[PDB]
Amino acid sequence: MKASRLYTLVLVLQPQRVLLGMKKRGFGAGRWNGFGGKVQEGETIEDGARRELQEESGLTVDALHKVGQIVFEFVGEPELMDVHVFCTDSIQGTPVESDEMRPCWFQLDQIPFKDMWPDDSYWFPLLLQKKKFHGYFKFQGQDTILDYTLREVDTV
Numbered sequence: 523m524k525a526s527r528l529y530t531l532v533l534v535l536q537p538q539r540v541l542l543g544m545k546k547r548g549f550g551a552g553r554w555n556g557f558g559g560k561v562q563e564g565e566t567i568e569d570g571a572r573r574e575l576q577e578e579s580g581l582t583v584d585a586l587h588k589v590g591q592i593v594f595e596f597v598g599e600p601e602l603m604d605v606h607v608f609c610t611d612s613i614q615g616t617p618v619e620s621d622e623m624r625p626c627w628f629q630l631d632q633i634p635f636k637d638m639w640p641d642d643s644y645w646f647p648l649l650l651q652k653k654k655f656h657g658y659f660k661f662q663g664q665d666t667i668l669d670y671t672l673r674e675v676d677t678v
């Protein structure tokens with residue numbers, strides 16, 4: 523039994539492209555990823571996801587839809603990362619570089635998997651297919667998966 527900390531992950535997914543952010547600092551720096559961060563006290567998970575999207579990309583959206591949940595375990599870290607994954611296709615501003623993230627659009631036949639977290643190669647395809655998923659990944663460091671589980675679900 524480990525304890526877990528709540529995080530969000532937000533993918534702006536349109537019919538032919540996806541918005542990713544190049545992490546400029548901190549955890550996972552140098553990788554393209556969705557936008558997000560720790561959920562704060564007093565906010566719902568969805569509202570934390572909306573806040574992090576605004577802070578890191580400049581985009582303000584009224585609503586997100588939950589598409590997945592992924593638990594990350596790191597060797598040597600007793601605390602699990604409980605990551606709630608959200609999507610939307612509906613935006614109405616331009617992405618803006620923040621201190622944390624540089625946003626960039628990618629065509630959906632140019633998803634930059636080699637420069638994303640290794641786990642994304644497994645669950646991102648389900649997201650593209652509009653399937654919901656539960657995942658778990660145990661990492662040695664930032665590059666090596668020692669164990670993982672991925673399942674399509676009907677309810678996240």
Ligand SMILES: Nc1[nH]c(=O)nc2c1ncn2[C@H]1C[C@H](O)[C@@H](COP(=O)(O)O)O1
Pocket residue numbers: 529530531548549550555556557558559560594603605639641642
């Ligand atoms: N293995 C992984 N794969 C992934 O796609 N995103 C991850 C991840 N591990 C952490 N993240 C995301 C979850 C959060 O959005 C962010 C971590 O929080 P901050 O470093 O505070 O932004 O990175």
Ligand SMILES: [Mn+2]
Pocket residue numbers: 558559560574577578622
């Ligand atoms: Mn953040």
Ligand SMILES: [Mn+2]
Pocket residue numbers: 558559560574
């Ligand atoms: Mn934060």
Ligand SMILES: [Mn+2]
Pocket residue numbers: 557558559560574578622
């Ligand atoms: Mn963040």
